[PDB]
Design an enzyme around this catalytic site. Structure first.
Site, PDB file in Angstrom:
ATOM      1  N   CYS A 166       8.546  46.177 -44.847  1.00  0.00           N
ATOM      2  CA  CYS A 166       8.089  45.583 -43.598  1.00  0.00           C
ATOM      3  C   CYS A 166       8.163  44.063 -43.614  1.00  0.00           C
ATOM      4  CB  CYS A 166       6.658  46.030 -43.290  1.00  0.00           C
ATOM      5  SG  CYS A 166       6.538  47.634 -42.467  1.00  0.00           S
ATOM      6  N   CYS A 226       1.225  42.707 -47.086  1.00  0.00           N
ATOM      7  CA  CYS A 226       1.521  43.744 -48.059  1.00  0.00           C
ATOM      8  C   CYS A 226       2.759  44.527 -47.630  1.00  0.00           C
ATOM      9  CB  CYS A 226       0.322  44.676 -48.225  1.00  0.00           C
ATOM     10  SG  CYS A 226       0.147  45.895 -46.903  1.00  0.00           S
ATOM     11  N   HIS A 229       2.279  47.306 -35.183  1.00  0.00           N
ATOM     12  CA  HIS A 229       3.037  47.087 -36.413  1.00  0.00           C
ATOM     13  C   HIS A 229       4.466  47.560 -36.180  1.00  0.00           C
ATOM     14  CE1 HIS A 229       3.535  46.360 -40.722  1.00  0.00           C
ATOM     15  NE2 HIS A 229       4.200  47.501 -40.777  1.00  0.00           N
TER      16      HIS A 229
END
EC number: 2.3.1.16
Lengths: 710, 436, 436
Positions: C99, C422, C392
């Site tokens: 990500c 993260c 997200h």
């Protein structure tokens, strides 16, 4: 603090009690007489308070939860009273625990064997971690014993009659994943939340309100249990040959517990301990257990060892790949393979493939880790990349100059840190070194028939060998799951030396018109696995015989087999399983059943006469030559310790474990009493049965090689 | 320093290069048949680390890339670390650039290694032309999406009522460009035609590429760069490349039908490199790290350059465009440049590059430079043959040339090497090498 | 020595961030339905060039990383130029790193114009959960692999005999790791159980993030970096994100059953990011050329850090590991950090991070640092909400925070912004932002 013992009680804010088992002494969690009494005081204190609702047992030890009963504790038993009294106090201990009405939960982590599952079966519920070290089992039969109490009557009633019987008998290992599937454990939880997951299970209202059903309820009752016991009893007696106790006992004590109630199994298993705990087999298996553990704890040498992380092997083929597989796949150490022929590396790497990925077909593991295991085995045709190899293995032909040439060049073509290991057949280790610029780190191993079945190796140093080299070599076997024995550098070594008369005497008695089928069965009933001829052919006739002239030229002619009949087998393409034709029919065309030997060896054999010698006589004569060589070989201290001599023979050749070992047999049979019966055989057959010098010494005056305690 | 740029790091260390390795190249069917490209990169990295004194924990980042990709495990670099014995704390990262993926990987390793985040890396690539992933028809791509999102069984039957016609046959692979549709050999013919190259002017570069390489194998000069392949079937190992045919005469393969035009196809199959499978891997680290651990670097690195052109005609002039940029960035010249290495993916085109690199017209108008870069000597041009021999793995011909170049200039005991390659999409590469 | 990495070029010019933009996010199966992620990147970059009034031919490299890629379009970056008005001579390529593709896109583009091989860069990302590249089962794929190589028509019938009704169902999408199989929700739960995260404070973060974001949108502060997406149907434009539920109560949050661990899980849909689709684009100029063309740098770039961790336990400690490295490279401290921003993938993992960033024990042994990183003041912690609000969209998460952070520090004094995030596979990202 010597009074807390290991059982310490602790109650949280909720109405539950957490129990920790921290042994003040050794890391492993054992059971003594004092634990049995103090836990009764603890549980009595637990009974007085009515506010509680459940109890959970915690290992409180990163090593294990509870290892089991201490073997020395059984060893202190003298008569049937102590075995039954210990059995008697064991029955009430869990019955008092099982009489509790509230939920009892056990958190299992680490190890749980023997007396470990006694507590687990005494608890209504149990939870175990998914950590791959936890395991459940009853390793009591291998010690000449049986589970202390309840195991033969409540577990079949809890896990099933068919399921429980084999675990007690086979003594196999049950993993966490298959434990949940069978139903012994209610749930499997991570170690991080092992204690917390047991919290809610103790809060459950039902201790036991709806037991799980049995899918194999078909034979439940008296309709098939007797039929099952008859078959497995016939199955057990045939596999155990009838020379092992506590085999039919398990069937009987399981039968009495299942048929007429649990309390009946209590007395029978208590009665079983009356005889089974005090048995020459029981002491034999307990003695080898202590002997086997001693050598594993023994580090072989005294100087601190040396680093070993990169492994090189000079030779592929089949034998060379055997070491690499054990070194890489099992020990997790990279191995480099060098050969002058790529097909030698090809065979070894392919052979590693063929022996591996069989568990894949059995779904015991996945291919995700298989590639990593193959990643530790490397093959090459050049010396390049061997400069970082800490140890090198010589696995090629036993030509002395060829060995001297390679040891000189590998000394030339490697760093000084690398030490030398040689798998010699009969050549001396010091003679192999000879012109070595670095002789102090030259040592010799000795492997055998494929080492995935052979459970030990040899440590064979020469005159100049640093104790670091022995320490590295002895510790090399330990991580390989092998038993290291330091032996004196002599021609024929120790295991190879003693088997030469054994195969010599077998060939000598083969040619005098005796049928092989009856004599072979007689020898394997004695307690020996595998008969003489079948053991002789699959290991390599040429390899095994190659030491006999070395045996002949070193000690005497007692090792020589009858000539012109054994050598005829060599130059006849009849070279055992490797050559595709020898002795037994190897096609196995009889529906893969017990094939009879080739009906053409007998014409090539002299086979003059009849059976002549009795069945018990041929079996003992086989073990006499083993003992006659054993008494002679260790007379000149070919073995560092008597225990290493025992574990060298009882665990490498196949001496009857129920008899304990070579000098276990000597002490058992009246010591010097056996000295008489060999001399008459010497007068009957020949001088090969002459008693040893110190064997006469112990025989004449009366001695036992093991003072110890008696 | 308006054009020359040093390749020194922040700490005063030049970008050193350590010895490199290359998997032997084999045809798609004689060998390497059915094996994925996953193991090829795994195979080389496992032994390259287990060949020198370096451990696997020192490297902090791996950059690979494959021109032919598998949809499963898109990031090939991650499974290389996972598959082989490698530090699980390494910065896995993969790139993609046709015919120069290793070249781009080397540049990406070089640019990141200077910033000080990473001080040592391994660069390479894997290519496999026998497990080509065959995609389904695009019509049978929405239907599968539509059926999965369908709720009731009755809706499922109606959707497949549209399923008929030639949708059941698969889609075989092709090399025509997405937005140009040129087969990269059809456009190679017109470079030969426009620049006037004959089949006899070529077919000797291919011959001299077949030679100097068969001689190289017999001499064993390039024995260090080639591994001995092990096959999991374990029938027989391969040590020498089977693609090379350095035994046929020049007049033997001149009587061949053209491949693309078949009418004016002055190029054929023999003088054009065939598809193969292989891989390569090289050890890259800064000068400060290299000396402090005691390992001699296989030369060093001077500069690099990439130049792109519009992909509609004569698009393989990347070496024509990229090469002069490398010389000015390294502040060098063809005169003081020992040995060069051209991609020579086809007969001619590369010969046109020597024609164009020797042409002042191309440099004056298409580049804006005052002077052309200059001509190259034949002896200083592909000393060990060229790509018309070993083969052309698209993602593996990158690292192949540097290892031979640094090793050859090591035999030459100095000099500055140069490697360029043409790529699809009008892409090119150019580097200047220095073996100290 | 001082391990400080001031981000200035060879000329000494520091790296600037002239501007940035984000496409508004929307839930799956909404207005953003059926749209390939390739179209999102094309649409967003088309308007940004017009908004920034900068010419398209100036930029010399584009990098766009995307999760949930389309195998039909392997290199999205090239097709963006082929789809938009970007100059064909663009020297663009695509990346993929969990990500943090945008953070990786920021990292390599910033170091790209560091080396002088290019002069200008623009970074961004785009991903869409509405369309899925759903594939067939691998064996069924293999069945079609073998039939393609078959030459005999009669051989085709025998080779399709290996078939089953279980093969015809497609493979639905999943998020479990290749070598681990643990979902992020499984990861987020294990920190909650081990470190200790109560749902009351976890859902409090979601409520506070929702309210802070809802307050921000009503004030219109995050209006200049959020455009108004247009749909090809052109039924209605979307100007504000529909993910944020600005009218919610803590009692409403408490009545959600746990999803991942329905027994002891302390995370729900309230305190977890939902599935949203969107994009963002940001232009990265060095300060030398930003002044040359007459644009104000919307902040600058100081330093960056990435740290990797284990994949079996504690996978979301990337901000715990990556953050201390960035401060040392930036030569800064949490004490002089005006605004702090971090990725709120889950409330449980978020509260653990500040707990672990406030944990001296974690820093002394896991990180090896002499002291802990510092304290995270709640006032400066996610002022405009966090990831539990907008959504997200995988790729756009990295670019989204930077624009708002630079915009927010623009609304305040200079300060030093910080962003951490993260990632799966034990990956983490951190950097320190200047904003004057």
């Amino acid at each position: 603090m010597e009074m807390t013992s290991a059982f310490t009680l602790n109650v949280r804010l909720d109405n539950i009690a957490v129990i920790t088992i921290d042994v003040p002494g050794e890391k492993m969690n054992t059971l003594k007489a004092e634990f049995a009494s103090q836990v009764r005081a603890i549980i009595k204190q637990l009974r007085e308070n009515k506010e509680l609702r459940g109890v959970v047992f915690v290992s409180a030890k990163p090593d294990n939860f509870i290892a089991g009963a201490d073997i020395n504790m059984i060893g202190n038993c003298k008569t049937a009273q102590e075995a039954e009294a210990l059995a008697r106090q064991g029955q009430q201990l869990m019955a008092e625990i099982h009489a509790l009405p509230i939920q009892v939960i056990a958190a299992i982590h680490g190890a749980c064997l023997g007396g470990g599952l006694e507590l687990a079966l005494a608890c209504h519920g149990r939870v175990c971690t998914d950590d791959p070290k936890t395991v459940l089992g009853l390793p009591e039969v291998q010690l000449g014993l049986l589970p202390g109490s309840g195991g033969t009557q409540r577990l079949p009633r809890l896990i099933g009659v068919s399921t429980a019987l084999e675990m007690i008998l086979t003594g196999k290992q049950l993993r966490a994943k298959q434990a949940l599937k069978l139903g012994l454990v209610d749930d499997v939880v991570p170690h991080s939340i092992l204690l917390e997951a047991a919290v809610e299970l103790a809060k459950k209202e039902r201790p036991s309100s709806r037991p799980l059903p049995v899918r194999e309820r078909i034979l439940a009752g008296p309709l098939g249990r007797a039929l099952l016991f008859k078959m497995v009893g016939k199955k057990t007696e045939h596999k155990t040959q009838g020379n092992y106790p506590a085999t039919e006992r398990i069937l009987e004590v399981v039968e009495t517990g299942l048929a007429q109630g649990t309390s009946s199994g209590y007395d029978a298993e208590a009665r079983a301990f009356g005889e089974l705990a005090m048995t020459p087999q029981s002491q034999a298996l307990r003695s080898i257990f202590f002997a086997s553990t001693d050598v594993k704890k023994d580090p072989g040498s005294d100087a601190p060892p040396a680093p070993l992380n990169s492994v090189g092997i000079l030779g592929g083929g089949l034998m060379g790949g055997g070491i690499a597989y054990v070194t890489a796949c099992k020990a997790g150490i990279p191995v480099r393979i060098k050969d002058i022929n790529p097909q030698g590396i090809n065979h070894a790497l392919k052979y590693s493939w063929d022996q591996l990925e069989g568990k894949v077909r059995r779904r015991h593991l996945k291919a995700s880790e298989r590639d990593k295991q193959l990643a530790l085995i490397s093959g090459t045709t050049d010396y390049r990349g061997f400069a970082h190899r800490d140890l090198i293995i010589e696995a090629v032909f036993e030509n002395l100059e060829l060995k001297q040439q390679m040891v000189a060049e590998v000394e030339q073509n490697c760093a000084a840190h690398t030490i030398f290991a040689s798998n010699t057949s009969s050549l001396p280790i010091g003679d192999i070194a000879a012109h070595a610029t670095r002789p102090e780190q030259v040592i010799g191993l000795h492997f055998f028939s494929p080492v995935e079945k052979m459970p030990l190796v040899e440590i064979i140093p020469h005159a100049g060998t640093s104790a670091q080299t022995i320490a590295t070599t002895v510790k090399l076997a330990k991580k390989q799951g092998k038993t290291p024995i330091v032996v004196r550098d002599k021609a024929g070594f120790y295991v190879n030396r003693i088997l030469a008369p054994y195969i010599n005497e077998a060939i000598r008695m083969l040619t005098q018109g005796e049928r092989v089928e009856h004599i072979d069965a007689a020898l394997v009933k004695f307690g020996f696995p595998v008969g003489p001829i079948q053991l002789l052919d699959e290991v390599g006739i040429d390899t095994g015989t190659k030491i006999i002239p070395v045996l002949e030229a070193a000690y005497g002619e007692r090792f020589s087999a009858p000539a012109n009949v054994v050598s005829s087998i060599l130059n006849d393409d009849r070279k055992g399983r490797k050559n595709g034709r020898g002795f037994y029919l190897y096609g196995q065309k009889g529906r893969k059943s017990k094939k009879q030997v080739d009906p053409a060896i007998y014409p090539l054999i002299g086979t003059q006469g009849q059976g002549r010698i009795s069945a018990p006589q041929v079996a003992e004569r086989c073990v006499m030559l083993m003992l006659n060589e054993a008494v002679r070989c260790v007379d000149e201290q070919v073995i560092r310790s008597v225990r290493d001599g025992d574990i060298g023979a009882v665990f490498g050749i196949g001496f009857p474990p129920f008899l304990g070992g070579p000098f276990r047999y000597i002490d058992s049979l009246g010591a010097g009493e056996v000295v008489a019966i060999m001399q008459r055989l010497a007068t009957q057959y020949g001088s090969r049965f002459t008693p040893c010098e110190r064997l006469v010494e112990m025989g004449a005056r009366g001695e036992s090689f093991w003072k110890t305690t008696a | 320093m308006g054009q020359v740029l040093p390749l020194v790091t922040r700490q005063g260390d030049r970008i050193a290069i350590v010895s490199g390795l290359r998997t032997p190249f084999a045809r798609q069917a004689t060998a390497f048949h059915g094996i994925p490209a996953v193991d090829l990169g795994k195979m080389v990295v496992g032994e390259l680390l287990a060949r020198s004194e370096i451990p696997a924990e020192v490297i902090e980042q791996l950059v690979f890339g494959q021109v032919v990709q598998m949809p499963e495990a898109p990031n090939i670099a991650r499974e290389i670390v996972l598959g082989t014995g490698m530090n699980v704390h390494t910065d896995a990262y993969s790139v993609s650039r046709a015919c120069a993926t290793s070249f781009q990987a080397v540049a990406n390793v070089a640019e990141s290694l200077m910033a000080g985040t990473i001080r040592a890396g391994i660069a390479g690539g894997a290519d496999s032309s026998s497990v080509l992933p065959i995609g389904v028809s695009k019509k049978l791509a929405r239907v599968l999406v539509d059926v999965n999102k369908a709720r009731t069984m009755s809706q499922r039957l109606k959707l497949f009522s549209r399923l008929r016609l030639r949708d059941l046959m698969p889609v075989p692979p092709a090399v025509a460009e997405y937005s140009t549709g040129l087969r990269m050999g059809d456009t190679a013919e017109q470079m030969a035609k426009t620049y006037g190259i004959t089949r006899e002017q070529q077919d000797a570069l291919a011959h001299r590429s077949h030679q100097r390489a068969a001689q190289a194998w017999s001499d064993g000069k390039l024995k260090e760069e080639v591994m001995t392949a092990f096959i999991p079937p374990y029938k027989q190992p391969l040590v020498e490349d089977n693609n090379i045919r350095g035994n046929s005469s020049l007049a033997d393969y001149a009587k061949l039908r053209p491949a693309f035009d078949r009418k004016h196809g002055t190029v054929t199959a023999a003088n054009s490199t065939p598809l193969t499978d292989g891989a390569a891997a090289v050890i890259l680290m800064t000068e400060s790290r290299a000396k402090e651990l005691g390992l001699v670097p296989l030369g060093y690195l001077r500069s690099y350059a990439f130049t792109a052109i519009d992909v509609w005609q004569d698009m393989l002039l990347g070496p024509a465009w990229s090469t002069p940029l490398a010389l000015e960035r390294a502040g060098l010249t063809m005169s003081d440049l020992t040995l060069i290495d051209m991609h020579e993916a086809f007969a001619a085109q590369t010969l046109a590059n020597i024609q164009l690199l020797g042409s002042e017209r191309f440099a004056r108008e298409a580049l804006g430079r005052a002077h052309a870069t200059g001509e190259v000597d034949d002896s200083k041009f592909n000393v060990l043959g060229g790509s018309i021999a070993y083969g052309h793995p698209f993602a593996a011909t990158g690292a192949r040339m540097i290892t031979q170049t640094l090793h050859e200039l090591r035999r030459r005991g100095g000099g500055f090497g140069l490697v360029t390659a043409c790529a699809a999409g009008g892409l090119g590469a150019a580097m200047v090498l220095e073996a100290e």
